[PDB]
Scaffold this active site. Structure first.
Site, PDB file in Angstrom:
ATOM      1  N   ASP B  25       7.831   5.894  -1.523  1.00 22.95           N
ATOM      2  CA  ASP B  25       7.268   5.391  -2.765  1.00 22.95           C
ATOM      3  C   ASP B  25       5.797   5.782  -2.821  1.00 22.95           C
ATOM      4  O   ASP B  25       4.959   5.113  -2.210  1.00 22.95           O
ATOM      5  CB  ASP B  25       7.438   3.874  -2.845  1.00 22.95           C
ATOM      6  N   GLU B 118       1.754  -6.209   1.479  1.00 21.48           N
ATOM      7  CA  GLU B 118       2.644  -5.690   0.445  1.00 21.48           C
ATOM      8  C   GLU B 118       3.914  -6.532   0.534  1.00 21.48           C
ATOM      9  O   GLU B 118       4.833  -6.223   1.290  1.00 21.48           O
ATOM     10  CB  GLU B 118       2.908  -4.189   0.615  1.00 21.48           C
TER      11      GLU B 118
END
Ligand SMILES: [Li+]
Ligand SMILES: [Li+]
Lengths: 337, 337, 337, 337, 337, 337
Positions: B25, B118
């Site tokens: 990503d 995250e």
């Protein structure tokens, strides 16, 4: 949530089966309805927390048979999704808010004036929903607020149960003329070792008057108190008969919101209308024949299971017309682990 | 750790599969790298807690693209054993310390100036790693310290999805000329009852402009707030089209360490570069055709599962050009229990 | 042994609970005793295989109420260890040999003249012990030998059950004055979708005369026949009333060893003494009011579960005063998977 | 049924998900429809067994696009309950009978002239539904009857897959400038050790022409043959490129009922329209660069798992421009245990 | 209670097997008896908490070999039911009260003057009963009260183990003349990757003098300290030999209740009488030959498992005659997850 | 494969642990090597089936110490993958073929002249690998072919075990001066109820000469014979001593391929070199003192578990100097269910 077995506990309450049995219990449900009725005026503009509302019946009693400021209906099982529709269909979604949450991790918009809940298990404590109730009391009940029920009692009595002993132990003596007596030891171990739920004690099988042996004050009782509950008893036998064991039940008491009003009782014993709890029978390994004037004295202990937090063991100590250490019998019943 | 399903959650992170998808990503990983870059000077001699460091990528950004006093890289899964070697092989074992511990039972040598993590799940909250993040903030983040991200937003929009409805519901009408329409009810129940992860919403299928409906302040939000998150919405439809349902995504925001600097955003929506989260599609049981000027108003509720603490249910309430109780529709999507 | 669930099936028979219920069934146990009595002379010097002897009661009837050459008592559960002691304590260890083996992998010292077994499950076939019985017949029963029972019948009748429908479906209309009718659909799905074991059908609730719909010849029936058993029925209703559904029971028949003797029957229906099987109730989703002269015609299918080999599904097809395809209703009851 | 994992296998087929993927496969479904079309005349008054009919699509093709004497549609999963309604709603319940039974314990009213089934798994054999098909052929297919498909082929080719190797192995070299190369060994073990389902092999990535390596004659093949299937291969590389591994697919062939007619093929390879099977990729631990004229020779073995009967291991042996024992490489891929 | 695996932990202690091994350990049991003896006078009218009393042996030592005011014997397993009878049969039910409770949710009638417990696991910490002990200390031990043991030490030494390496690794070289050397890599991974419980280290196989590497003060140590325990070591080798790995053991120390008295030690090392713990062996992947004057320096880390709270990983870092980062070896042993 | 528990059985053999214990058993492994040696000439151009070859040791003995036509090495566990490499590395892949298959579903290219296998479990039959061996004999062994071993014997002897009874039962009398005698009943039930694997019977503890009680002819024995194996015994006690119970072991016998050659024996008893099986001890509930001239007569029964097909129960019947029914004692030992 694993040693509380929450998936199984709350999964059983997502099905209509258990709710059908609760609402079919008329003494249980009508008692709560009359507590709301008998206290209707005092409940106006009060805030009520219905802890473990299930289908929402107690919340609908509050909203429809009184005019509170608000009712918080709290249900951890999937049934809460339907509760929300039921309160809407009964015109109460302006008063009743439904939270699909556990009491333990509960966030309510305000504190509450009354905490009403139907938490009683078998022999009062089985499944220990009382623990959830007390946690929510400490976090959300205002000082001076009401607990409904406000107290609860455990009652016991020495009893007869010819039906149970003959069908489960003496049956094996000569069924159809065969000598199956060798199985009696295993009958004793399999049938008489565990408590019998849903026993219907007949009044003529009480060998004394029942006595309250444990009493819980819902305002002062602490969670730490539930680890080990013990009471003392003495019985003078009033009928001659056979002492097969002890029957146990409970009472729940509901104080009036106002000084001047009387209390309302939910009695699950043998002299009251039968409830879905019925009574619970604990049989001795061997029966003993008693006669008027005999004294059966000892204690009963409700010891919580340290691992499986919804379970407990009930230990009986008793003595017949003696106060000596060597005539003292004991027996421990798991419920269920 | 059972109703958190920690063995399965952290077992999935011991494998490279999930880390390969995270580092692949680019919008997600490069955003964190640019936050470190854009704030490099301000981070000097600061102490950073990288909560749930995984392979350690964010910690290596801090140690290599800035000069902090120390970085605490915390990873509960078995991947931590490899993180320790990766930080050594990248010349950072003088700055980065790796703790194979859960945030919940974490002991760090000092408090920290910045907590970077995250943690975002599907629809922001799925799996509730946010709870771990907030516990560690309360125990280890210094007063005045930074949370990265510092705020997070949930965005929704009423949408079209002809592809999804025709392939999963209308497909059964006449496949190869056979009348398989009897299966439509079960198609409805099996395919449209659950949210669709990894939906790629095309811009031309938005029927209004997306609106942020829930916003989380990472400094003030409390764990008790995550039990039940609700937002309101009103949409005026701008294209004529068919209302198949709602698409949902999130944003994460990163405040500059210094007053004068601007914020950095991680946008997972349809007008931004696609991420491994994509978007999440919630289809109505039946589609409704809308036209410009129509108003679709209601609420969305993110209700945490009381038993399975990594799960939640998303409930939509909506109304089309009416404000009446009887035209109000609801639908509840589990995610996943 | 997993899709037969043998550990659970045979584990339930290692406990006295299930044996207590079987020997407490007087019609069931006394029928077997009278078959031995009524055939005592013909059984002399015969060899008997008691398949699934349990406590050994049928074997003790043979050894004590007749003089056979030998009796082979076969029990796969742990109860066999006790059977061996029971036959010793009843003075029969010279005639009765006890094998702790499954019928399927059974080695007996000789073939047998009579195979006697009590294998009937709910609606005759539930748990499919019949399969074991037939395998042992094929391997161990001599040509011309006796099967006891020698035939078995499944009987059904269209019935009333106001008690069941009002307590489980119409209850929700107005309990304590609340409108809980929204729960009726889920009551329908939860309560009326499954068969009700231990239903006690009252004679005044039969709307026609019961009819045998399936008949099993224990000498000719093959294991392959049990996969799918179907019967046809037509009923002319004799009382006006409400058609809530169908009640089902069975009969077992015991031919005399000698031509000239009459058969002995075990009837579990509503006009016979109640047994531990009682009867089994299958309710329609919605009741229909019928009146004298109406015809209810169709079929019943006992379809074995292909994966869980102890289970089956019962499918009803029926029609009221019509022979058209479009007035034909169906409903499938699992038992239990 | 446990080492066949029948509860999970047949549970996956009770859901519409897998049927939606099968009927959405147009090459797969239209091939079966054209086999019925192309053979319509020859099928008149024939009896067809549709083994594992699923939704019943093949049975409806037979009943609607031809005039057979009867069609037996056999489905072990719960989907059979719906199949019965689908054949009724398509006007075929006079021709098609639906049996909710496993092929293994199947009782059909007559033998059959054609056995048609769609049994192919990944790499032809995965899940070994072929075993069920062959058992039913032996018990129910008449001598001289048709098997559809009548033969099946496994095809392989040495291939390139830069996409796969760079994203899963070489990715770790320098992501975002960090040296994550230490993870390459674990990438090798986690990503390249297992076959990759749903690989889409591009024609320009074939390094030779594909070769059929195993062929199954559906009339002569025995169940005992499926334990261990092996084929030999030799490839001369036609493009210069990189040998990352082998891609595998299958073909199914359908002989005409009449001598004079041609066969119909279902090709799942890279030069045919893509199917829900796609192709299956098997990567070498390390790639080797090849150039025109090179020979890659060896064998492929499909070894059935002795415990988990739905699984197998695929073992590759190969050699590059040598015939010596010491240059011979091997690699074994589980699928999946 | 699931990631503590309490059902299995406490289930193993409900059986006599583990108690038989503890009471058969004479050094372990007699040490506790001599601590009571050596401190008998000082213990008079003290209140003792025996945490995890098991059979009650330590409690009976206190009550019979001293005259305390009271002893609280706390046991969470089912063995507590028998403890109550054992203290009665030894004439101590006036002094010793037995609580079937976990230390964590424990309610005692008063605080205590001495907390005595036998909590040591393998390598001191395995199973982390120390956590329970410290929780009960904080809630129930009076200020200034005694902890028995009062401190505990972890000791290690670099060692030889020719027996272990030859039988588990070099065995495969030429057993019976066959070359099974290909299995050595898997021998390395299977046998040398885990610690070896119940290793009996011979004195002549120590390559230096053992050193205490970690020390726990039972009064000051906090639960948060147990997450990650690390110690440093340096060894100068005194015999020439082969460095196969490290052996580990522990000591428990018991301070006298009175200033003037000396401490009592429980030594589980190789120069003391063998205990049921023996010693624990950690082998290197490859042995290295050492000679007098060589230095083996590094650290040992006891890192608690974040998910399975009864488990930990032991990580060794070491270096031979060098202080450079590139000659530094590491190896991590799970115990057991 | 579930009531055979094949995943656990064959999973234990995929690890080196069990193979290390088998190859470390020198009497066991060298016996097989000498059978190959002693029969080397007769084995030339014979075809050998090594059933359950494990690491392949017996197959390598055949291929290297003789010149057969071919050897089929059959192993169902994952160890077969390594066997294939071991036979290659020992230069035998032209003679030995390795099949990763179960004996039950085995396809070999030809029939075989010799079936050699090491199948013996505890007390010969535990785990019933004998069943696999006999199935493969019936399908694959040529008429007149050899079974190795060719016969097997179960031997028993009445014995002493003061060590075992004092440490497990009489220990509880006065440990450290405490009266723990109340635990003796539970010691009896927990320790003496099960057989003791790995008992090392000393010759001076035999109270008579051991007697073979069961003998298995590997050519004639049928699978149906293993359901229930029984033997008779009579012992005259030769030393005065204490009868604590019975010790059991087995022998395996290997006939020469040629008439004129002698048999080779594998003896696991107390007068032979100890094997990894050692001997198996079965203790009486209470010991009885015997004296020279006493007779201990009765039977031993090896009854296979009907559900768990790898398990059995061993039942002892015995009598001391009497032949009466009322002096006859029995005791049943599970192994293990
Ligand atoms: Li759990
Ligand atoms: Li299973």
């Amino acid at each position: 949530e694993d040693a509380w077995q929450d998936d199984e506990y709350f999964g059983n309450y997502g099905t209509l089966r258990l709710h059908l049995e609760m609402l079919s219990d008329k003494p249980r449900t009508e008692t709560y309805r009359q507590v709301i009725l008998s206290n209707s005026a005092a409940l106006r503009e009060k805030v009520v927390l219905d802890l473990g509302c299930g289908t929402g019946v107690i919340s609908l009693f509050c909203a429809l048979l009184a005019k509170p400021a608000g009712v918080y209906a709290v249900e951890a099982s999937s049934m809460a999704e339907h509760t929300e529709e039921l309160v809407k269909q009964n015109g109460c979604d302006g008063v009743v808010t439904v939270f699909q949450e556990r009491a333990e991790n509960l966030t309510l918009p305000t504190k509450v004036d009354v905490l009403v809940s139907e938490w009683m298990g078998n022999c009062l404590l089985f499944e220990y929903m009382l623990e959830s109730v007390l946690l929510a009391r400490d976090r959300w009940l205002k000082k001076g607020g009401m607990m409904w029920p406000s107290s609860a009692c455990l009652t016991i009595v020495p009893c007869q149960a010819f039906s149970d002993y003959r069908q489960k132990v003496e049956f094996w003596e000569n069924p159809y003329g065969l000598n199956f007596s060798y199985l009696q030891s295993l009958a004793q171990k399999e049938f008489l070792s565990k408590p019998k739920f849903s026993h219907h004690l007949q009044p003529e099988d009480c060998l004394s008057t029942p006595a309250d042996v444990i009493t819980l004050d819902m305002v002062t009782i602490q969670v730490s108190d539930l680890e080990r509950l013990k009471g003392e008893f003495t019985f003078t036998v009033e009928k001659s008969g056979m002492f097969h064991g002890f029957t146990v039940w409970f009472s729940a008491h509901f104080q009036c919101l106002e000084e001047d009003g009387p209390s309302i009782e939910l009695n699950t014993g043998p002299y009251s209308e039968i409830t879905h709890w019925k009574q619970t029978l604990f049989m001795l390994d061997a029966p003993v024949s008693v006669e008027e004037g005999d004294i059966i004295a000892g204690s009963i202990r409700l010891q919580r299971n340290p691992i499986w937090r919804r379970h407990l063991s009930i230990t009986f100590l008793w003595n017949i017309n003696s106060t000596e250490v060597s005539t003292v019998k004991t027996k421990c019943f798991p419920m269920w682990r």
